[PDB]
Amino acid sequence: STQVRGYDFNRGVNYRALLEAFGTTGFQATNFGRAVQQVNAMIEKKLEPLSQDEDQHADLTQSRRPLTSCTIFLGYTSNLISSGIRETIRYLVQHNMVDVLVTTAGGVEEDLIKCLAPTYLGEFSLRGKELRENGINRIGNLLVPNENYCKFEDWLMPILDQMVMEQNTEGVKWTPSKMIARLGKEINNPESVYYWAQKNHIPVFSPALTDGSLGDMIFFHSYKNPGLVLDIVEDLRLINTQAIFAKCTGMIILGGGVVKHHIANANLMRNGADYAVYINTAQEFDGSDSGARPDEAVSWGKIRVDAQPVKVYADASLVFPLLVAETFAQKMDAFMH
Amino acid sequence: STQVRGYDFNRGVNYRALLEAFGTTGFQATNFGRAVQQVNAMIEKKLEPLHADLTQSRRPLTSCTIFLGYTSNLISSGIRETIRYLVQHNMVDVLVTTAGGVEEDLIKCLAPTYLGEFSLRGKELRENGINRIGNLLVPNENYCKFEDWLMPILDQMVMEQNTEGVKWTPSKMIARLGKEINNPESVYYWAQKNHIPVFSPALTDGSLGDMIFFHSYKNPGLVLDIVEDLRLINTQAIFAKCTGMIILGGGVVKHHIANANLMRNGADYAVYINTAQEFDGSDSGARPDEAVSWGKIRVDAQPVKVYADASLVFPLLVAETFAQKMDAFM
Amino acid sequence: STQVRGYDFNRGVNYRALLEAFGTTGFQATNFGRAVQQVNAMIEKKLEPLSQDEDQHADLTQSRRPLTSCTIFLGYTSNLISSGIRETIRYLVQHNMVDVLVTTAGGVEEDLIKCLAPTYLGEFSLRGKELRENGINRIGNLLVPNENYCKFEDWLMPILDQMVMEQNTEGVKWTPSKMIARLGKEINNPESVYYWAQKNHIPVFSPALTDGSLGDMIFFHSYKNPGLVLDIVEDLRLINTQAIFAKCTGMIILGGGVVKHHIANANLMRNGADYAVYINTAQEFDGSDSGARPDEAVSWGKIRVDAQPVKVYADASLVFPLLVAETFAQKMDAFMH
Amino acid sequence: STQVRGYDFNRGVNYRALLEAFGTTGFQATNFGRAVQQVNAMIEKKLEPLHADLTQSRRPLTSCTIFLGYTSNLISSGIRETIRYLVQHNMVDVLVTTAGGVEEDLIKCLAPTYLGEFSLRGKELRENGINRIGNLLVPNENYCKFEDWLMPILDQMVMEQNTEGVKWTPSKMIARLGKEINNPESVYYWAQKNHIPVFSPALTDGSLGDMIFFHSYKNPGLVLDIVEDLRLINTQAIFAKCTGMIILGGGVVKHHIANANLMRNGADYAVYINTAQEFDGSDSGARPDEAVSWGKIRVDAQPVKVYADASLVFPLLVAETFAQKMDAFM
Numbered sequence A, C: 001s002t003q004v005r006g007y008d009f010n011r012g013v014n015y016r017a018l019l020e021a022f023g024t025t026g027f028q029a030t031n032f033g034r035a036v037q038q039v040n041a042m043i044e045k046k047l048e049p050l051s052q053d054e055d056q057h058a059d060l061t062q063s064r065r066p067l068t069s070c071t072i073f074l075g076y077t078s079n080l081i082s083s084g085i086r087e088t089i090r091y092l093v094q095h096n097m098v099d100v101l102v103t104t105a106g107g108v109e110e111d112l113i114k115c116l117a118p119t120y121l122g123e124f125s126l127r128g129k130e131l132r133e134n135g136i137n138r139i140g141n142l143l144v145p146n147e148n149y150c151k152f153e154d155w156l157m158p159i160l161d162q163m164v165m166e167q168n169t170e171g172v173k174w175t176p177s178k179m180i181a182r183l184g185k186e187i188n189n190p191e192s193v194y195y196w197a198q199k200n201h202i203p204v205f206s207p208a209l210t211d212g213s214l215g216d217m218i219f220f221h222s223y224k225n226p227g228l229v230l231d232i233v234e235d236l237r238l239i240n241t242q243a244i245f246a247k248c249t250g251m252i253i254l255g256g257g258v259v260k261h262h263i264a265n266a267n268l269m270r271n272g273a274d275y276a277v278y279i280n281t282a283q284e285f286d287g288s289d290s291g292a293r294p295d296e297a298v299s300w301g302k303i304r305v306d307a308q309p310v311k312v313y314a315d316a317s318l319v320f321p322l323l324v325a326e327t328f329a330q331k332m333d334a335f336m337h
Numbered sequence B, D: 001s002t003q004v005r006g007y008d009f010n011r012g013v014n015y016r017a018l019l020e021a022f023g024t025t026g027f028q029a030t031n032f033g034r035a036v037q038q039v040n041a042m043i044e045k046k047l048e049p050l051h052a053d054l055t056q057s058r059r060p061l062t063s064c065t066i067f068l069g070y071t072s073n074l075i076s077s078g079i080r081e082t083i084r085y086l087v088q089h090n091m092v093d094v095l096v097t098t099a100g101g102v103e104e105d106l107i108k109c110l111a112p113t114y115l116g117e118f119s120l121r122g123k124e125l126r127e128n129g130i131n132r133i134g135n136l137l138v139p140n141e142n143y144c145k146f147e148d149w150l151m152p153i154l155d156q157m158v159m160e161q162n163t164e165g166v167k168w169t170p171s172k173m174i175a176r177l178g179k180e181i182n183n184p185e186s187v188y189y190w191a192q193k194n195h196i197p198v199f200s201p202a203l204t205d206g207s208l209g210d211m212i213f214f215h216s217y218k219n220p221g222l223v224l225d226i227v228e229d230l231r232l233i234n235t236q237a238i239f240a241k242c243t244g245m246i247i248l249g250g251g252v253v254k255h256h257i258a259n260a261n262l263m264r265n266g267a268d269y270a271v272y273i274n275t276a277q278e279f280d281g282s283d284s285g286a287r288p289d290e291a292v293s294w295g296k297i298r299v300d301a302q303p304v305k306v307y308a309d310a311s312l313v314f315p316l317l318v319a320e321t322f323a324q325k326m327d328a329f330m
């Protein structure tokens, strides 16, 4: 039995020992320590060699991405890409540390737009009327000028032209994940999550890709250049197959909604994820999927019964960079060369 | 200036007077009274006397186009009946829900959902083939019945796509499933009967997705396009005379309605009931004033958010609004 | 097994049937139905006659309040007295429907001040600087003018003078509950909770009575008329004895903090309350007593193991008048004559 | 205008740089960086070079009087050590906590608290004599040890009241208990040694209350007066040169500090870390701008609230503030 004890600053500021002390500090600090242990267990599993029998069963996807002993799904809500967690996610993707991304439409487009123009710090309480009068859009305590989206429109419209031509003359059947790969290739910028995702053959799923500025642009585009089709059915096969043919899976989910359920539902197709860490601020009392505890997912088979899932009830803008510092970033050498 | 004063139970129990008194009780009771006022303003606008080629829709235009959105779990709840009533009587014009909010309305025509508790342990539920949704319970067998019912319909859909030129989208699929369920307890039976479109751009994220997925290995090729559905919802906003938004919960269902209304530079009326909070920067938790900065809500509008579980507040809101003006819809 | 089914408005607006349908609607509506059942079980117990053996054991307090088969503790946070729930609480107290009140200092003083000047509706977002510049204090979306407290000061200072004289020349040993009874007698106004509480011999406990405007006034008073003593130890004996010698107890607690723990801790002295209904918006993840689920209280013995406690996660300004409508208000005839 | 940008792990792991980057990461990470700035401004003010009869206190005045408040459960947590460190080094001037936040610091000198889980069932815990606090566990035997330790001290207190004229209050009792526990792991041992007063106006609401209650039937007559303690805390604010408030959690501990600062027309600096939200009208959930309307915070101050569990954020805040300026306290 482990005793409660906080970090003793009479020892000075030993930042690694201070982070390790979250485990015995209690409440959500203890859940953070548990989440570090779970993520490190996913990484240790991922780095374990595939046996010949395992290699066979998991080679049954024709994905150009080499298979590992643990397929890690990373999900995050759109606002976390508006935040500086965009940099944290880009790092993991750049170094092949996760295998599948799931995000909503804002989580795609704002990564691309940040390569064209920055997002600024503001405050939650700024009044919408005066903001609108000055052409400034608010995302929490962040601020995106209208001109950011104009730049986006000028960048994106020629690409949508090529996509429709390739659809109509080369037989391409677009889906959200294929479009996201193409946009990451086009942005051609190492600061972009989606640039690294397509470079590293990491598929990105986003079934409601029309729900944001990218949809605005497709909509306007469709009046000049009609007929672009985005099929979500093929993308459902594609994400589900990533789970079905995995040796092991881990889920790391920041926030709730479509991103959380879509990853969990893919893992239900294999009778459950082996490891699961949730960081989100939602609560269960309203019945929502977003606020459901991991144990709700156990009843469905989204998480295996012998898994030890962890939820940290906190804003991921605080927790996720600390989690990455104590896990993936310490095993970085294993992910390179 | 309005004084704070609660309902006086020395009057006895007049429930209408009791609900009216929420307005002067303060905190979220006061926001509830403001929400009643805003929804009654949408209805009164809708009822004022007064396109199909530009919206590609058969639904006639009224003086206020009302968009109703709700998360999936509210269809698991008994709020399913509240929503079905509004759709049955043609009181709203556009529905947005996520996939669970489509499929569980259909499954409830085949088998019931049951009351349970939030604390029931997942291992024992899983061993007994029972799935938990909050404090509700759905036996596995409900999804078996759903599968049996759905597979021949998916067969017809693929046949119609490949030989009759049908280009399926979520809203077109949802209309077809409501027609097929053919049951007056179903929200989507009434929506298609009354030509109320239902948008659900991630319709694959749930059990209908599972079923489409399994079905595709037996009968391949169904496609669901989300682009045409984006044109259909956006033009519902663009060509409206006025618009109101009533949004239960957060996520895709809230943003998708607000973004359609951004296309007309903003909704005229807006009422939110949701439990999310702003501090995590989320769109779900954003106050209505964030949407004003984007132009999703007009600067002159008077939007209202009630911070509460909609399973408590939405039946009361409907009692004091739509259900009072039933003669006009009738 | 009970099926989920909401109220069907094709039946018209039958408000009683609509409230009854919360029970099968799910999420917090179902918890509301459960809370109605629990409160009605407290009332049904309270109205059951005392047997001679029970009458004996419970007559062992020298309280002038006649003993019943279920002693009900009603607790509420200060802001709920700023709200119109003040009227709901006054009704229950006026008709002897509950037996012990617990509230914090704002929950005492603002009931008295509402007899001198009203509280007004405002908005949460009004800016503090301009409010302060206009002498208006904000409580959530409510507004209290400075002049309300001036009126309070003019009303209260003569009473504090008498209290010190009675302490120093008549041997009175003041405690929060004795002071609250005296203030309710002095306000002499049927709109006041504390007026009815002292009329009906319902004790009010508030151990941190100095934490608010009443404390401000005692503080200033003490420089002109020193030495007023408020003992909290005697009041601890007094609340605890209400629980120890009860036949049965019920707890109805609106909100968290001192009010919730102080009632629960009194019931721990009898190895637990028989019935418990909580209405509060706090959540458990931060470890707080305020956000603790009823089941945490079971581990201590604050709630009996065979009790069926209920928590409704909601703002009590919405829920509590509905709860009272479906419970105490329907049994009003039993509480009169 | 500051651009949004997260820490770049291609730099490797420099934890100081990682914490600095919270400022430009957004949402509550940005509020954390603002909280570091405000606490460092209080400390820098306190360290500027520069009554006992009017405050009735032996503690010398500095250029910034800092009030630290925390709820009881944070002393159940390992934040007890963080708080003990600040008090041990005389870094804050006034403590406010509720009764659990006094007694569990003393009990931890007698027996440990253990890690558990939130979901552990109360019936089985109760059958095993284990009490739950969030995901922490306190065996009944800890309170037996507390009783044995406390009873002879309560005896001395009653004797001193009745024959040496002592007029006990919560703060005077807490000072005596810290002296008696005589253990350098204890917050309150350090507070009395360093003449930092601790205010707790509902000190009866917890296990020390239970013990006082039982003790009074064996040795009657102890009185705890809260009026003199109100004069003592209020005069700490009134005669300060400047004040800052650092408040972990909500309830009595937050209001009691803010109300003392209302007496001087408002604190100069204020940092809140709490999980409560405003919508229910509560004082716990009130934003700092509500306190500005009352005059509890000066209109020119720049207060900061971080919406987060303090068990995560407070050790990081101390790392970047007080623990960096340790040489000046030393």
Ligand SMILES: NC(=O)c1ccc[n+]([C@@H]2O[C@H](COP(=O)([O-])OP(=O)(O)OC[C@H]3O[C@@H](n4cnc5c(N)ncnc54)[C@H](O)[C@@H]3O)[C@@H](O)[C@H]2O)c1
Binding pocket: A076, A077, A078, A079, A080, A082, A104, A105, A106, A107, A139, A208, A211, A212, A213, A254, A255, A256, A257, A258, A259, A279, A280, A281, A282, A283, A290, A314, A315, A316, A317, B250, B251, B252, B255, B276, B280, B281, B282, B283, B284, B285, D027
């Ligand atoms: N920047 C934007 O927010 C933005 C921009 C474009 C479009 N959209 C659209 O809005 C819709 C809804 O957005 P969404 O589903 O991505 O999520 P969301 O923003 O609605 O958040 C869903 C839930 O995730 C959790 N969450 C959010 N932020 C968190 C954080 N910082 N830490 C921990 N938990 C957190 C909360 O419980 C929240 O209620 C999407 O379809 C999206 O495309 C949003």
Ligand SMILES: NC(=O)c1ccc[n+]([C@@H]2O[C@H](COP(=O)([O-])OP(=O)(O)OC[C@H]3O[C@@H](n4cnc5c(N)ncnc54)[C@H](O)[C@@H]3O)[C@@H](O)[C@H]2O)c1
Binding pocket: A256, A257, A258, A261, A282, A286, A287, A288, A289, A290, A291, B070, B071, B072, B073, B074, B076, B098, B099, B100, B101, B133, B202, B205, B206, B207, B248, B249, B250, B251, B252, B253, B273, B274, B275, B276, B277, B284, B308, B309, B310, B311, C027
């Ligand atoms: N939960 C289910 O029943 C279920 C079933 C199948 C599929 N799914 C899938 O889960 C994904 C996410 O579900 P979602 O987007 O519909 O919402 P969600 O359930 O994730 O809720 C999102 C937010 O809505 C607000 N909300 C939820 N319930 C509320 C209530 N009772 N009252 C007020 N506000 C409330 C809360 O802030 C919540 O965080 C969807 O893609 C969905 O198809 C869910």
Ligand SMILES: NC(=O)c1ccc[n+]([C@@H]2O[C@H](COP(=O)([O-])OP(=O)(O)OC[C@H]3O[C@@H](n4cnc5c(N)ncnc54)[C@H](O)[C@@H]3O)[C@@H](O)[C@H]2O)c1
Binding pocket: B027, C076, C077, C078, C079, C080, C082, C104, C105, C106, C107, C139, C208, C211, C212, C213, C254, C255, C256, C257, C258, C259, C279, C280, C281, C282, C283, C290, C314, C315, C316, C317, D250, D251, D252, D255, D276, D280, D281, D282, D283, D284, D285
């Ligand atoms: N009007 C005021 O708020 C006021 C005025 C004078 C003094 N004070 C002092 O402030 C201190 C703290 O106040 P408190 O302990 O009474 O509580 P609080 O206002 O701090 O609330 C405590 C918790 O109770 C719950 N709660 C609050 N309002 C609720 C509601 N409407 N519905 C459901 N749950 C709700 C929430 O979880 C909240 O965090 C007290 O000592 C009090 O005397 C406050």
Ligand SMILES: NC(=O)c1ccc[n+]([C@@H]2O[C@H](COP(=O)([O-])OP(=O)(O)OC[C@H]3O[C@@H](n4cnc5c(N)ncnc54)[C@H](O)[C@@H]3O)[C@@H](O)[C@H]2O)c1
Binding pocket: A027, C256, C257, C258, C261, C282, C286, C287, C288, C289, C290, C291, D070, D071, D072, D073, D074, D076, D098, D099, D100, D101, D133, D202, D205, D206, D207, D248, D249, D250, D251, D252, D253, D273, D274, D275, D276, D277, D284, D308, D309, D310, D311
């Ligand atoms: N909980 C215990 O360990 C315990 C033990 C004995 C007695 N009690 C008694 O319970 C009563 C109420 O306790 P309380 O007033 O100290 O506070 P509480 O625990 O009731 O918390 C009040 C509010 O503080 C905020 N808060 C709590 N923990 C937080 C965290 N980890 N991070 C950020 N914010 C947080 C939350 O909004 C919470 O609703 C007191 O009178 C106390 O003496 C509690």
